[PDB]
Amino acid sequence: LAKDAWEIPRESLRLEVKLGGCFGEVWMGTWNGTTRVAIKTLKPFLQEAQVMKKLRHEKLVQLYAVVSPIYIVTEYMSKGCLLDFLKGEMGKYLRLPQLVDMAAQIASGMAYVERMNYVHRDLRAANILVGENLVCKVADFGPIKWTAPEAALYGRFTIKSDVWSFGILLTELTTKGRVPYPGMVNREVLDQVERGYRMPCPPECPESLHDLMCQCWRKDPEERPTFEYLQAFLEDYFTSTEPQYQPGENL
Protein backbone atom coordinates (compact mmCIF):
# COMPACT_ATOMS: atom_id res chain seq x y z
CA LEU A 1 0.00 0.00 0.00
CA ALA A 2 2.77 2.45 1.10
CA LYS A 3 0.98 5.06 3.25
CA ASP A 4 2.20 8.66 3.72
CA ALA A 5 2.54 10.69 6.93
CA TRP A 6 -1.16 11.69 6.80
CA GLU A 7 -2.07 8.05 7.47
CA ILE A 8 -3.22 6.99 10.94
CA PRO A 9 -4.66 3.77 12.38
CA ARG A 10 -8.49 3.41 12.46
CA GLU A 11 -8.17 2.74 16.21
CA SER A 12 -6.91 6.27 16.90
CA LEU A 13 -10.27 7.84 16.03
CA ARG A 14 -13.30 7.83 18.36
CA LEU A 15 -16.64 8.42 16.58
CA GLU A 16 -19.47 10.01 18.59
CA VAL A 17 -22.57 11.80 17.19
CA LYS A 18 -23.82 11.31 13.60
CA LEU A 19 -24.25 14.64 11.80
CA GLY A 20 -25.29 13.91 8.21
CA GLY A 21 -25.39 10.95 4.14
CA CYS A 22 -25.95 9.49 0.65
CA PHE A 23 -22.41 8.34 -0.32
CA GLY A 24 -21.04 8.07 3.24
CA GLU A 25 -21.34 9.72 6.68
CA VAL A 26 -20.22 12.73 8.72
CA TRP A 27 -19.47 12.46 12.43
CA MET A 28 -18.28 14.56 15.27
CA GLY A 29 -15.33 12.84 16.94
CA THR A 30 -12.38 12.78 19.30
CA TRP A 31 -8.90 12.02 17.91
CA ASN A 32 -6.70 9.96 20.25
CA GLY A 33 -8.47 11.38 23.35
CA THR A 34 -7.40 15.05 22.98
CA THR A 35 -8.71 16.63 19.78
CA ARG A 36 -12.27 17.21 18.51
CA VAL A 37 -12.56 16.22 14.84
CA ALA A 38 -15.09 15.78 12.07
CA ILE A 39 -14.88 12.47 10.22
CA LYS A 40 -16.08 11.94 6.67
CA THR A 41 -16.64 8.22 5.92
CA LEU A 42 -16.96 6.68 2.43
CA LYS A 43 -19.03 3.76 1.10
CA PRO A 44 -16.92 0.70 0.12
CA PHE A 45 -7.58 5.18 -6.13
CA LEU A 46 -6.69 8.05 -3.74
CA GLN A 47 -4.80 10.31 -4.31
CA GLU A 48 -6.99 11.88 -5.72
CA ALA A 49 -6.70 13.14 -2.12
CA GLN A 50 -3.42 14.75 -3.12
CA VAL A 51 -5.61 17.87 -3.36
CA MET A 52 -6.82 17.96 0.30
CA LYS A 53 -3.23 17.15 1.31
CA LYS A 54 -1.37 19.87 -0.63
CA LEU A 55 -3.79 22.72 0.08
CA ARG A 56 -3.44 24.67 3.33
CA HIS A 57 -5.23 27.98 3.97
CA GLU A 58 -7.23 29.51 6.87
CA LYS A 59 -10.44 29.65 4.79
CA LEU A 60 -10.27 25.99 3.70
CA VAL A 61 -11.26 23.22 6.13
CA GLN A 62 -8.04 21.58 7.33
CA LEU A 63 -7.32 17.91 6.81
CA TYR A 64 -5.87 16.20 9.88
CA ALA A 65 -5.59 12.54 8.83
CA VAL A 66 -6.78 9.96 6.27
CA VAL A 67 -7.39 6.18 6.53
CA SER A 68 -6.87 3.40 3.89
CA PRO A 69 -13.49 1.78 5.25
CA ILE A 70 -11.82 4.96 3.84
CA TYR A 71 -11.92 7.84 6.38
CA ILE A 72 -11.18 11.55 6.10
CA VAL A 73 -10.53 13.40 9.35
CA THR A 74 -10.58 17.21 9.52
CA GLU A 75 -10.94 20.22 11.79
CA TYR A 76 -14.44 20.48 13.35
CA MET A 77 -16.77 23.17 12.01
CA SER A 78 -19.40 23.76 14.69
CA LYS A 79 -22.18 25.33 12.68
CA GLY A 80 -22.33 22.71 9.92
CA CYS A 81 -22.82 23.54 6.24
CA LEU A 82 -23.60 27.02 5.02
CA LEU A 83 -26.65 25.87 3.08
CA ASP A 84 -28.27 24.62 6.34
CA PHE A 85 -27.07 27.61 8.38
CA LEU A 86 -28.59 30.07 5.95
CA LYS A 87 -32.04 28.47 5.72
CA GLY A 88 -32.15 27.62 9.41
CA GLU A 89 -32.94 29.95 12.28
CA MET A 90 -29.93 32.16 12.16
CA GLY A 91 -31.02 33.19 8.64
CA LYS A 92 -33.79 35.64 9.47
CA TYR A 93 -31.07 37.59 11.29
CA LEU A 94 -28.28 37.68 8.65
CA ARG A 95 -28.06 40.91 6.79
CA LEU A 96 -25.90 42.01 3.78
CA PRO A 97 -22.97 43.04 5.98
CA GLN A 98 -22.68 39.55 7.45
CA LEU A 99 -23.39 37.91 4.08
CA VAL A 100 -20.80 39.85 2.07
CA ASP A 101 -18.36 39.03 4.80
CA MET A 102 -19.08 35.32 4.53
CA ALA A 103 -18.72 35.84 0.74
CA ALA A 104 -15.31 37.57 1.25
CA GLN A 105 -13.90 34.67 3.20
CA ILE A 106 -14.93 32.10 0.63
CA ALA A 107 -13.42 34.31 -2.17
CA SER A 108 -10.16 34.32 -0.17
CA GLY A 109 -10.08 30.56 0.37
CA MET A 110 -10.73 30.38 -3.39
CA ALA A 111 -8.10 33.03 -4.17
CA TYR A 112 -5.62 30.67 -2.49
CA VAL A 113 -6.93 27.77 -4.62
CA GLU A 114 -6.29 30.07 -7.63
CA ARG A 115 -2.67 30.96 -6.68
CA MET A 116 -2.04 27.21 -6.35
CA ASN A 117 -3.44 26.42 -9.84
CA TYR A 118 -6.14 24.11 -8.61
CA VAL A 119 -9.88 23.89 -9.37
CA HIS A 120 -12.62 22.99 -6.90
CA ARG A 121 -15.40 21.91 -9.36
CA ASP A 122 -18.37 21.80 -6.93
CA LEU A 123 -18.43 25.20 -5.28
CA ARG A 124 -21.82 25.92 -3.65
CA ALA A 125 -23.31 26.56 -0.21
CA ALA A 126 -23.68 22.81 0.53
CA ASN A 127 -19.92 22.57 0.41
CA ILE A 128 -19.06 25.59 2.61
CA LEU A 129 -18.70 24.96 6.34
CA VAL A 130 -19.45 27.55 9.09
CA GLY A 131 -17.69 27.57 12.43
CA GLU A 132 -18.04 29.93 15.37
CA ASN A 133 -18.02 33.76 14.85
CA LEU A 134 -19.43 33.38 11.30
CA VAL A 135 -16.19 31.90 9.96
CA CYS A 136 -16.65 30.18 6.57
CA LYS A 137 -14.39 27.58 4.96
CA VAL A 138 -14.41 25.75 1.63
CA ALA A 139 -14.72 21.94 1.86
CA ASP A 140 -15.39 18.74 -0.18
CA PHE A 141 -13.20 19.25 -3.25
CA GLY A 142 -14.17 15.78 -4.64
CA PRO A 143 -25.87 19.65 -10.00
CA ILE A 144 -25.72 21.66 -13.23
CA LYS A 145 -27.40 24.79 -11.74
CA TRP A 146 -24.12 25.81 -10.03
CA THR A 147 -21.91 24.72 -12.97
CA ALA A 148 -20.65 26.98 -15.77
CA PRO A 149 -22.06 26.03 -19.27
CA GLU A 150 -18.67 25.13 -20.76
CA ALA A 151 -18.17 22.57 -17.99
CA ALA A 152 -21.65 21.13 -17.68
CA LEU A 153 -21.51 20.74 -21.49
CA TYR A 154 -17.85 20.17 -22.51
CA GLY A 155 -16.16 18.95 -19.25
CA ARG A 156 -14.14 22.17 -19.44
CA PHE A 157 -13.65 22.72 -15.64
CA THR A 158 -11.28 25.58 -14.70
CA ILE A 159 -10.74 28.15 -11.97
CA LYS A 160 -12.98 30.31 -14.17
CA SER A 161 -15.84 27.87 -14.03
CA ASP A 162 -15.37 28.03 -10.21
CA VAL A 163 -15.85 31.83 -10.50
CA TRP A 164 -19.15 31.14 -12.15
CA SER A 165 -20.28 28.93 -9.26
CA PHE A 166 -19.13 31.68 -6.90
CA GLY A 167 -21.64 33.94 -8.60
CA ILE A 168 -24.37 31.30 -8.04
CA LEU A 169 -23.29 30.98 -4.38
CA LEU A 170 -23.75 34.80 -4.20
CA THR A 171 -27.42 34.32 -5.08
CA GLU A 172 -27.61 31.59 -2.40
CA LEU A 173 -26.18 34.00 0.21
CA THR A 174 -28.43 36.86 -0.72
CA THR A 175 -31.65 34.64 -0.77
CA LYS A 176 -30.87 32.95 2.56
CA GLY A 177 -30.26 29.66 0.74
CA ARG A 178 -32.99 29.24 -1.95
CA VAL A 179 -32.23 26.90 -4.84
CA PRO A 180 -31.19 29.12 -7.72
CA TYR A 181 -33.21 29.29 -11.01
CA PRO A 182 -36.42 28.91 -8.95
CA GLY A 183 -39.21 27.11 -10.77
CA MET A 184 -36.77 25.95 -13.49
CA VAL A 185 -35.67 22.35 -13.84
CA ASN A 186 -32.13 21.30 -14.96
CA ARG A 187 -32.96 21.23 -18.72
CA GLU A 188 -34.71 24.61 -18.77
CA VAL A 189 -31.66 26.16 -17.05
CA LEU A 190 -29.20 24.67 -19.52
CA ASP A 191 -31.39 25.64 -22.42
CA GLN A 192 -32.12 29.19 -21.06
CA VAL A 193 -28.56 29.98 -19.92
CA GLU A 194 -27.11 28.94 -23.34
CA ARG A 195 -29.53 31.50 -24.78
CA GLY A 196 -28.25 34.38 -22.50
CA TYR A 197 -30.66 34.28 -19.50
CA ARG A 198 -29.31 35.21 -16.08
CA MET A 199 -30.97 35.35 -12.66
CA PRO A 200 -32.23 38.84 -11.99
CA CYS A 201 -31.36 41.04 -9.03
CA PRO A 202 -32.58 39.19 -5.86
CA PRO A 203 -35.11 41.13 -3.68
CA GLU A 204 -33.38 44.01 -1.85
CA CYS A 205 -29.85 43.04 -3.02
CA PRO A 206 -27.89 46.07 -4.38
CA GLU A 207 -27.35 46.35 -8.15
CA SER A 208 -23.60 46.65 -7.74
CA LEU A 209 -23.63 43.19 -6.12
CA HIS A 210 -25.87 41.76 -8.80
CA ASP A 211 -23.46 43.32 -11.26
CA LEU A 212 -20.70 41.32 -9.59
CA MET A 213 -22.89 38.29 -10.16
CA CYS A 214 -23.21 39.10 -13.86
CA GLN A 215 -19.42 39.58 -14.30
CA CYS A 216 -19.13 36.09 -12.73
CA TRP A 217 -21.55 34.77 -15.35
CA ARG A 218 -19.91 36.05 -18.57
CA LYS A 219 -20.13 33.63 -21.55
CA ASP A 220 -16.33 33.86 -22.12
CA PRO A 221 -14.59 32.19 -19.17
CA GLU A 222 -11.67 34.64 -19.62
CA GLU A 223 -13.68 37.82 -19.04
CA ARG A 224 -14.93 36.48 -15.65
CA PRO A 225 -12.87 38.09 -12.80
CA THR A 226 -10.35 36.43 -10.52
CA PHE A 227 -11.14 35.20 -7.03
CA GLU A 228 -8.57 37.79 -6.01
CA TYR A 229 -10.56 40.60 -7.57
CA LEU A 230 -13.73 39.09 -5.93
CA GLN A 231 -12.00 38.78 -2.55
CA ALA A 232 -10.84 42.41 -2.60
CA PHE A 233 -14.06 43.99 -3.89
CA LEU A 234 -16.06 42.12 -1.22
CA GLU A 235 -13.84 43.02 1.77
CA ASP A 236 -13.97 46.71 0.85
CA TYR A 237 -17.59 46.53 -0.26
CA PHE A 238 -19.01 48.91 2.35
CA THR A 239 -16.40 51.71 1.89
CA SER A 240 -15.67 51.57 -1.88
CA THR A 241 -18.97 50.46 -3.49
CA GLU A 242 -21.91 50.91 -1.02
CA PRO A 243 -20.87 53.53 1.50
CA GLN A 244 -24.58 54.53 1.84
CA TYR A 245 -25.95 51.10 2.57
CA GLN A 246 -28.86 50.86 5.06
CA PRO A 247 -30.51 47.66 6.41
CA GLY A 248 -33.96 46.64 5.05
CA GLU A 249 -36.48 43.99 6.09
CA ASN A 250 -34.37 41.10 4.79
CA LEU A 251 -30.92 42.42 3.73
Ligand SMILES: */C=C\C(=O)Nc1ccc2ncnc(Nc3ccccc3)c2c1
Ligand atom coordinates in the same frame (compact mmCIF):
# COMPACT_ATOMS: atom_id res chain seq x y z
C1 LIG B 1 -24.98 21.02 3.76
C2 LIG B 1 -25.05 19.55 4.20
C3 LIG B 1 -23.89 19.15 5.12
O1 LIG B 1 -22.82 18.81 4.65
N1 LIG B 1 -24.11 19.31 6.43
C4 LIG B 1 -23.16 19.23 7.41
C5 LIG B 1 -23.58 19.48 8.72
C6 LIG B 1 -22.67 19.41 9.78
C7 LIG B 1 -21.33 19.10 9.53
N2 LIG B 1 -20.45 19.04 10.55
C8 LIG B 1 -19.17 18.74 10.33
N3 LIG B 1 -18.72 18.49 9.09
C9 LIG B 1 -19.54 18.53 8.02
N4 LIG B 1 -19.07 18.26 6.76
C10 LIG B 1 -17.81 17.95 6.39
C11 LIG B 1 -17.57 17.75 5.02
C12 LIG B 1 -16.30 17.42 4.56
C13 LIG B 1 -15.25 17.28 5.47
C14 LIG B 1 -15.48 17.50 6.84
C15 LIG B 1 -16.75 17.82 7.29
C16 LIG B 1 -20.90 18.84 8.22
C17 LIG B 1 -21.81 18.91 7.17
